[PDB]
Structures are given as C-alpha cells and as structure tokens.
Design a protein around this ligand. Structure first.
Ligand SMILES: *C(=N)N(Cc1ccccc1)N(C)C(=O)[C@H](Cc1ccccc1)NC(=O)[C@@H](NC(=O)[C@H](CC)NC(=O)OCc1ccccc1)C(C)(C)C
Ligand SMILES: *C(=N)N(Cc1ccccc1)N(C)C(=O)[C@H](Cc1ccccc1)NC(=O)[C@@H](NC(=O)[C@H](CC)NC(=O)OCc1ccccc1)C(C)(C)C
Ligand SMILES: [Cl-]
Lengths: 300, 300
C-alpha cells in the first residue's frame, strides 16, 4: 500500500552530469556519447543578456574557453555548435556510462523527474509536471542551470527538460534537449510573463482513481455526466478541457476500479461545486494534478 | 528559488540493491562490502509468521538455501548471522560499487530518502519522515521489504531504515541496519497497532520559514506568544510539544528572515485556530511537517 509523489531512480542520469565553465559562469552539462549539452547562455555575461546575438557571441569563443570537468577529470572540448537554445560541445571522450536514451518533447500535463545539480554535483531528485502554462514549479538554486528532467522506461532514459531560467515570480522555464523552449520564454533579459495557469484535469481524475484504488471512496457517487456537461463545469473552475483521448488514457484505471471515466467525472464535478467540506483525499486537502494516468498505474 | 519535497540522488544506493530468495519468499537485500543485509523474516513461510522461532528456523538453514542475485549474476553465500531482526549474509565477493557508508539510528521527526525496490530492482525514490509514533507513511508494494532509507552527507551514505512490514492501517514499520525496530513493533503476525500520531511542530515551523524565504508570507502577523501558551493551543490540535531545543534549532532560519521563532509560533497558532480561509502556503492547503530545519537550510 501507499501512494507518494515518486521520482525515478536517478543513477543513470547522475553518471551523465558534468560541470561546464565559461569565464566566471559555472553551470551543469549533460554528457552523452561524445557530446555535452548545456544552455547556450553559458557563453553570455549578465550584460550580454540584454540584447545578445548568440551567433556572434559564439563566433568569438574557442574550444579552449569551455572548461568541462567530469568529477575531477577535465574533458577536452574539440568542437562546438548551437542547436536552438542548447549548446553542443563535442569532447574527445565518449561518456562510458551513457545509458540507452532518447530526447522527447513532452506535452503540458506530463510529469518527469528532475535531478537538481550544482556545479556538476547532483543535489536531489523530485517529480515535476509541465504546467499548462509551460512553466514548472521546481527547486533550482544558483548553479542549477543545465539540470535535466527525464522519465525512464525499460532501462531507456527519455530526457525531456533542461533548466535555463527563473522568472521574477519564482517559476522556472527551460527547453527540451533540442533547445526549443517550453512556453513563450526566451534566453534574454526582456519582459516576459507566464500566462495564467490552469489545472490538469486528466491528472486529477487519475489521482481520484488512485484514491479509490487505495481505499479512499467518500467522494464517489452514483451519478454520471456527459463530457460536454463536465467541461462546461470544468471551464468555470479553471480546469483544462477533458478530451476523448484523455478518457481513453484513463480506461485502464476505469477497468481496474470498475468506475466509468464519466462516473468519476460526476464525482469531480461535485467536488468542484461543493468543495471538500473539510475532508481529504489521499491526505491532501486540494485536488492533486501532478500525477498522470501512467504514474498511477506504475504505482498501483 | 522554489521549495519541493526532495530526495537524495539514489545512484549510490542503487549500486547496493540485490535480490534475496529463501524458498518461495523473494525480497530485497543491501550489498555492502562482502555482506548482504535483509529482513530476517525472509526465512519464514506464511505459516511460520504466527509465532516464529527464528533461531530454530535458522538452525535448519544452509548457506546454499539463501539465493542472492545482483542483476543477472548470482552471489555465493558463505555465512550468516542474525543481529536482532536483520539477517546478515556473508558472500564471496565484495560489492565493487560499495559507497562510503555508515549505519545510523534516526530519531522521530527526522527525514530520510527511501529507494523503493522490487525484487532487487529500484522502482522509485521519495522522501519520508519518521513519525513520532515510529511509523513511516511510504509506498511499499509487493516485493518491497528490504528497501532502505538513507541520507547522504559529503559522498557518504548514512543508512537509517530497512523496510519489514505494514500495519493494518497501511502505515509502514521497519528497523535500523542493526535490526532494532523503530517503535514497539515485532516481526510476527500478531495484532499490532501504532500509537497516536502527532504533527511534528518544529518541522511545520521550518516549513513556514521556507515559505517566507520564498515569498509566501501572507500568514505572518505582528503578534507573539509564549512557548507555554503556544503549546497549550498546539496540544489541542495534536501537535507535538515544542521544546526550547526545537526553538534553538530554528535559530538560523529565524536569523535569515528576521522573524523570531515565537513570532512565527503565533502565526502558526492563528493558522490552527482559523484555518487557511482558502489560501495556500507553498501550494499546500495543509501544514507540511516532513521538512526538518536542516532540510529547509539545504534547499534555501
Ligand atoms: C543558472 N545556473 N542560473 C543561475 C541562477 C540560478 C538560480 C538563482 C540565481 C541564479 N540562471 C537561472 C541563469 O543563469 C539565468 C540566465 C538568464 C538570464 C536572463 C534571461 C534568461 C536566462 N538567470 C535567470 O534565470 C535570472 N532570471 C532573470 O533575470 C529574469 C529573466 C526573465 N529576469 C529578471 O529576474 O529580471 C529582474 C532581475 C532582478 C535581479 C537580477 C536580475 C534580473 C535570475 C533568476 C538569475 C535573476
Ligand atoms: C515484503 N517484501 N513484503 C511483501 C509484501 C509487500 C507489500 C504488500 C504485500 C506483500 N511484506 C510486507 C512482508 O513480507 C511482511 C512480512 C511480515 C508479516 C507479518 C509481520 C511482520 C512481517 N508482510 C506484512 O507486512 C503483512 N502485514 C501483516 O500481516 C500485518 C502485521 C501486523 N498484519 C495484518 O496485515 O493483519 C491483517 C492481515 C490481512 C491480510 C493478510 C494477513 C493479515 C502484509 C502487509 C503483507 C499483510
Ligand atoms: Cl494539501
């Protein structure tokens, strides 16, 4: 029994974290095969960030300006190129611990584990969701840029996130491993704000299913609803629309519990329109939305 | 910025997990140097658990009855000793991935990371607190016994917990790595109940300080309280008594923020007496008590 916000084991990713230094800036890089990936703003001073032309700033850099250390060992940079907002530093040595891996771009609402790092040293591991506004509510202190997020499937590590920046509101933004930012953010010092965040409806439902599976059933009811009627209510409470693809992804949990997705949707409607009235679900007083359907199945 | 439930990186511990089988029972063992540690009830059938005589059951055991597998490879057992409720299996090969390590017995209120494991295979990592009633609220599914809890300090793993059992209430119980149970529990199928759980007041306070540091400060107020007056209220809501040693532990966070500990105790008193009135702190609707003062300092 038991249900916790659970991160993937981080060993495979710990073996890939390295330290990258350009001038006074030190941050983290990801060492896979003979390439080290890191944020391209590693080449910028704080003053360059006002209006940087990364193409120019990178033309003025030599491989010997990039200091890469894997633990105590220095790694010789022998080439460099920029892909969107990520710098690719080719090194003379292939990471002998490179796991089987992929680069994937996740959709809002998807979860991943984050290996927080400082000057190449892993500090902690926690679970995150890509918010619908393409921010993440993480814990990234100074020297954490280049920390990565990932999921693991059958010994294969799917890297999905690299940390680049923090807004004045304290929320975090970054890129996939091809350098494309999630959300409307840019790696320069200009005005940018995250849109209004919403609740990940399909994840709340998956979590309610986790509650049932774990014996918490007080919120269940006999009632059913239609998808349109549910989303009309969902709209009002700042929930993301529930699509028929969501209903399909929830099918396996519906089967395990014998509760139709639309039966559970009526339970959720009632919680939105009446609150909880002092009770809790899985020990939470709010509806949790950072568990995907797949997270629940993996842990139930 | 940001504050999150954070586990230590699990790599060093993953390299220690093995599978231990005695008859039909399979669970997890911890492989350090040439010794494997596991719960001694690995030697019990479902029938033995009623009133088990561990000493008698082990007199009929040979080293070749214990099958240990590290990945795809078998590890030859060449000896055994029982220390309290932990079985120690001497093996012919020293784990080449043995980290620097120590065995420590934690106190209630302290936190540690748990590497949940299944048949020697890591499944996930999460952060736990030893409850004041010497239970833990984890996620331990089939094949989870022998999973360990730990802290990491300067490349050294301090193992503090090994998972043995789950009470009827769904809470979890275990031992230190010398086999001494936390709390009044025993490894036999007998009626067992956990004492009354209380809220870890000093941890709730450290978490309120984590909130302030991160800009979440709506709950602050001008008012102060005495330690005795605070504890009169706290007791009513099933909080642990706050001692002067607790107040002293909060000192560094008090200094960082300029909020005297007893001023924060009056903010907490008001939250207990009036609720949150719909707001949240660090995104939680309930007061969080599984962050120690040291945990907050590490992440802030
Ligand atoms: C990565 N290792 N770091 C260092 C760091 C991490 C955590 C806390 C402090 C420092 N970071 C996050 C960076 O190097 C990035 C680089 C960057 C700068 C600007 C735009 C994009 C990337 N720094 C930041 O994320 C900074 N954020 C900002 O400067 C934001 C960006 C919109 N603007 C901002 O805060 O403007 C007001 C302001 C106030 C005070 C100082 C500077 C700017 C940072 C979080 C470091 C302020
Ligand atoms: C460890 N690898 N496992 C396997 C497992 C993990 C999770 C879920 C199912 C199986 N576990 C936890 C064990 O082997 C231990 C061994 C044990 C048994 C009895 C006392 C001490 C250790 N099993 C348990 O923890 C079981 N717990 C109990 O039997 C508790 C002990 C007080 N009593 C109990 O549950 O009484 C009601 C009851 C209900 C159903 C069957 C038997 C008894 C377990 C959680 C597996 C029931
Ligand atoms: Cl909550």
């Amino acid at each position: 029994s038991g249900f916790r916000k659970m991160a993937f084991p981080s060993g495979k990713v710990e073996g890939c974290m390295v330290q990258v230094t350009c001038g006074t800036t030190t941050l983290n890089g990801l060492w896979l095969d003979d390439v080290v990936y890191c944020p391209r703003h590693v080449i910028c001073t704080s003053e360059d960030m006002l209006n940087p032309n990364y193409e120019d700033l990178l033309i003025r850099k030599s491989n010997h300006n990039f200091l890469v250390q894997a633990g105590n060992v220095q790694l010789r940079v022998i080439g460099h190129s920029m892909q969107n907002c990520v710098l690719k530093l080719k090194v003379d040595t292939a990471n002998p611990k490179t796991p089987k891996y992929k680069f994937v771009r996740i959709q809002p609402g998807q979860t991943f584990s984050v290996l927080a790092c400082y000057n190449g040293s892993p500090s902690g591991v926690y679970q995150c969701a890509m918010r619908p506004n393409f921010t993440i509510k993480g814990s990234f202190l100074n020297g954490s840029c280049g920390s990565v997020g990932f999921n693991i499937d059958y010994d294969c590590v799917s890297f999905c996130y690299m940390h680049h920046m923090e807004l004045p509101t304290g929320v975090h933004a970054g890129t996939d491993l091809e350098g494309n930012f999630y959300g409307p953010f840019v790696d320069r010092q200009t005005a940018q704000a995250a849109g209004t965040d919403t609740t990940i409806t399909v994840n709340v439902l998956a979590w309610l299913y986790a509650a049932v599976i774990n014996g918490d059933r007080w919120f269940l009811n006999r009632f059913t609803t239609t998808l349109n009627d549910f989303n009309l209510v969902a709209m009002k409470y700042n929930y993301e629309p529930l699509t028929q693809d969501h209903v399909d992804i929830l099918g396996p949990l519906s089967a395990q519990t014998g509760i139709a997705v639309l039966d559970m949707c009526a339970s959720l409607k009632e919680l939105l329109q009446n609150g909880m009235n002092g009770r809790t679900i899985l020990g939470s007083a709010l509806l949790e939305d950072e568990f995907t359907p797949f997270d629940v199945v993996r842990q139930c």
